[model samples]
Target chain A: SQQLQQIIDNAWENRAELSPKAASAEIREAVAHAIEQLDRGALRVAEKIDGAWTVHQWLKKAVLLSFRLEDNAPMPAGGYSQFYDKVPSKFANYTAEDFAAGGFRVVPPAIARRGSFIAKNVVLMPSYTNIGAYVDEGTMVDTWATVGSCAQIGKNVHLSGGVGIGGVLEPLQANPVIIEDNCFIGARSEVVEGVIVEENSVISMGVYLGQSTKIYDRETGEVTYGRIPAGSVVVAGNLPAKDGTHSLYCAVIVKKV
Target chain B: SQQLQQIIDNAWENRAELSPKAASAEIREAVAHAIEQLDRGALRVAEKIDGAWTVHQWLKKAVLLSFRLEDNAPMPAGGYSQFYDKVPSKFANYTAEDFAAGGFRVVPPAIARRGSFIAKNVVLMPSYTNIGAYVDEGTMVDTWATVGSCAQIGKNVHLSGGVGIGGVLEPLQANPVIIEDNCFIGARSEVVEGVIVEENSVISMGVYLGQSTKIYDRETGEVTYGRIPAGSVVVAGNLPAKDGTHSLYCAVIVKKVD
Candidate 1:
């Protein structure tokens, strides 16, 4: 872990010199090794520390650096669709044995880019999980849902069909989205821009949460932004416009589940 | 196209005998030929005719029939993952030449069934277009948008992220949803159950439309259902509930675009 951190730190320090056109051999090896650790679920971009999820900025730097180190090339998809991309599919070369050992079920057309970690008993149904993302065990990423880049997902989370869990990577210091354990995000809901959804939160359909979304609590008349409290039940709603003529979209915290 | 249609019709006439485990050689050839023409964009399940879109029922039956005549197989996507699907990818054997000739960009993770026709210059970004759907030229099916079975999308339509245009296949006479030319369906919106959005309308974000959706026109004290008028601009809003305490979700026609 110490050595991997050192490599990523150096890459971050020297990011200005790195480009798609060129990179030193040592830099390449370091980035590759870090990603391999990520692929094997030995490391992650963020983790819970002292009861708070903290970002390992260097790991994120490694993920960013790895993108600059590669070029788009042919990825043959079982003589099915033609796939060409800079980021290779996470399961680019696995047999039945490999999949069984992985202990996760990925239905056809689901994609997980390299540098993402998916644990056992995860059911990915025709969804996309971007690089640097961490989807934990027993999660159901339903059809057409997207786990954005570098977002942290917890165990037994139900990201329903068409849900979008947002990811953030720019500026290096910007925290990634975090959905803690047992969250049931309903269809078409989006949690993005580093918002922290605490454990056991139920977000209903069509609720869109950005960094600036005013999460209004119906009970206490309090408002929150960027973080959904634990065991909260949220839904799509409208708040009065500035002039009080029409309503603007908002997330209403109906009650605690 | 005519011959392919006839083949599908004949097969549909004898569909009771057709099963995945027991399709004869003649039925197999007919279904294969129909899908090939569909793959090449030479045939479609629906088309605009005399200003009214017409549904070619036989082609839809062919797509449904093709489902019964196939089995799931291992779809290897490299060392990274495994895919098992009844239908082969539209780009299954495509190369640079094929993509160039096709004149479309299918970003990685996009899947279109072989029975659908995607016209020239379409940009499919990590989305799913189901069988019997028709996406015309210059359309951009944004990420996570689902053009459901047999839905007809017009030219230059932008189906934004997480949009769902629902499909209706049963009761054979039931129409599929239609979005005419130059429409912009906003993000997280769904138009389902044969609702029609006329040409040049702008449907804003989070507007869920269906056969039962009460579309209120703010312009003139009028309301319509199952259709958005031509050149209308719509948005999400709520209507007064019968109980008088809360509002129920509804789509409001804010204005017309042009």
Candidate 2:
């Protein structure tokens, strides 16, 4: 296992040389093993260590390098149909036994691309999970929601209908979106662009969060951005602009839950 | 086709006469041809004529009447799965050749109901287009966006991710939602209840527009509703309430493109 990490580290160091036409056999094998570790719950992209979130940069590089190393091929869908894509479905060849062993539910029309991880007891309800995303146990990704690439979702989370947890894969080194445990993201909400939602927070319906979106804490009259504090109850509201001519939309932290 | 207007008119005159099990052959065929015209881009539910948008009320009636004329059944889906619904997918029985001829990309998981008019060069990115909707060319219906039933989408529109241009089907006389040419609707925005977004407008993210939603023009210090003027740049905001407990959400027109 120590040797494996060294291999991954070496591949990522020469990532410029790893491409669709240039990748060697060993690089592809190392990437495959990395994804297996992700799927088998032995390794993850990010973790909270010493009260800090540390991203494994080499694993993120592995996901990106795997794309160049792979080729597009036909995936047989059962009902007289076929799909030709570079990334394959997560449940492409799963059976009832496989699902029972995996301990998660993939309702029809729910799609999780390969290289993503879904822990036990997660219910994917007609949603989309992009590559490198990790959905922890007891999470219910409701209908039409999207868990974007490399985004990390913690346990017992309810991503309500039409939620978009945005992916930040580009720029190569950006942190993915993170929603900690026991959060309820309400209907039609969007948290994107590496926004970190801390634990046990409640985001109300129609709240949109980018890194630049204004966050107002009503209790302390503090205006902040890029993260929601732990145990906060946030709702959609507006703050008056400096000129007082128009008010712009911002997230209001109405209470601490 | 001339008689379609007359038959649809007669049906609407006695709309109480329509039932799911009681549609006659002539009535059903007339409605079917109406939907066929819609699907082939020969007819539309609404059009801009003489510098004013006029809804073809008879076609809207046909779209409304279609619900009573059909029954729910299983639609063959891939992977041993099936969808049971009153409406069938627009791509039912479509082959690779059919898709190539249509020149539109139906990414897996996108659903377009029967009677949708999707012109050439439209990219439906895992979205839903309901009955009688007209999505013109060069439009990108982004992920999780829904072009609702009887809605009118104009050319070169970008309906960004999670945007909902809502459907209007009931009341038998309600006007459907209309987005004029080249509008860009930002992510997580919603325009419902027959709201008209005129040409070239840029609606920022998280702006929800209903008939009752206040549209404030900041430059003019004006407050309006129901329709966004052409080329207006809109954003989500809140207005002061009379009670002052909390500001309520409203759409603020910050500027105009032209």
Candidate 3:
């Protein structure tokens, strides 16, 4: 794995010079192997280490390198339509026993791209999971929900209907959005731009948590941004401007459980 | 059409005894015919008549009855997966000429059910349009957006990414949610439970409007429900509780356009 990381890091550093036609077999092979590792859940873009979330930038680099190293092809979407994308469906070659062994349920029209890891007992209900995302065990990614690129979702999280966990891939320094264990994101809510929702937090429906969004703690009377504290119950609200003439949207931390 | 409506209304009234096996051929044929009408854009579940939106309850009943009269079958969703749903894909057997004549673009993985009507120049971008939905011409249903069962979307509507226009099926008197002409529903927004966004409304991101949601008119300082008036621009907000203990979510109508 160390050798693999070194190869990816070097490839990423020289990415400006690499293209599908110009890339060497060794670089392509390393990226493909890293993606296969991601697919098999042997590696992830980010993980919790010593109570801190540590990102594996090399794996992300491999994913991006794979994009540059590969070419778009037609993927049949049943019926008459075909998708033209570089990534393939994760379940493209899955067998019935493979699904049973994986212990996950993918309702029709649910699409998880290759290189994303979906853990056991997870239920994908007509949703989309992008490349490099990791959805852990027992999570319910409900109807029309999206697990964005490289985002990390923890165990027992219920991403309700129409929820969007936004993805980030560019700038190489950006962190992926993380939903820690036992979180409940209500319907139609969006947590974007690398915000972290710590464990056991309950976000109410329609609450938008972007990097620019203000997180207001009602009890502490403090205003913060980009992260939801553990065990906090959040809802959409507006903080009145100083003159009280207009209000701006914010996420209110009503209580901690 | 009157005959079709009468048959559907009667079937809905005696819905308790109807099932896939017990439904008569006459009833089945009528339901299929109604669904065909919906598919071909010859009929819709709701429409503006005399400048007021009027719902044709019989069409919705036919959609419900079709579900009862059909059995779930395998729907191949590319790869090795199959969706076990009763409704067939709208483009299941679409030919190149069929798509060309219909004048719509179905991006990969976009699934519109058979009973829905997608008009000319509509772009479906990897989304889901459920049964009985009506999407008009030049509309863009963006990625991950869902036009729920029987929902009516008007011309040039931009249903942005991750938006949910909720569907309504049960309770024969209930109306499907309506989005009138030239509306822009921002990302991650949901308008459900029979709510109506009148013509040319712009709904901002993350705004949820159910029947129970409050629509606060900032200029009038009035709170209303179930509808966004024509040409209104709305955003997500809250109405402070009387005791100052909490705030509840509401859709704030910030302004109206000509």
**Per-residue lDDT of model 1, residues A1-257, tens digit only:** 88778877987788888877878887888899988888888998888999978888888889889988888887665454665678877876666566767777776678788888988889887788999999999999876889999899999999876889887877588889999999998767899999999999998767789989989887776778999999998877666655747776778787897
Candidate 2 per-residue lDDT over residues A128-244, each given as its tens digit: 898889999999987678999889999999997688999876756677899999999976889999899999999976889998999988777678999999999987887776676
Q: Which number leads on lDDT?
A: 3
Chain B TM-score, all predictions listed = 0.94, 0.93, 0.95
Our tally of clashes for model 1 stands at 12
Ranking by DockQ: 3, 1, 2
DockQ of each: 0.20, 0.12, 0.21
The interface RMSD for candidate 2 is 6.0
Q: Write the per-residue lDDT of candidate 2 for residues B1-258, one digit (tens) a residue.
A: 789988887887777877877877788888888988988778888777997777788887898788677654433345433333455568776788988888888876687877889988999998878788999998999998888778999999999998887677665467789998899999988888899999999999988887867899999989898999999999987777554434656799999888
Backbone N/Cα/C clashes per model: 12, 1, 0
* Superior by DockQ: candidate 2 or candidate 3: 3
Residue lDDT tens for model 3, B137-230: 9999999898988899999999999898887875657888999999999988888889999999999998988887889999999999999999
State each model's CA lDDT, in order. 0.82, 0.81, 0.87
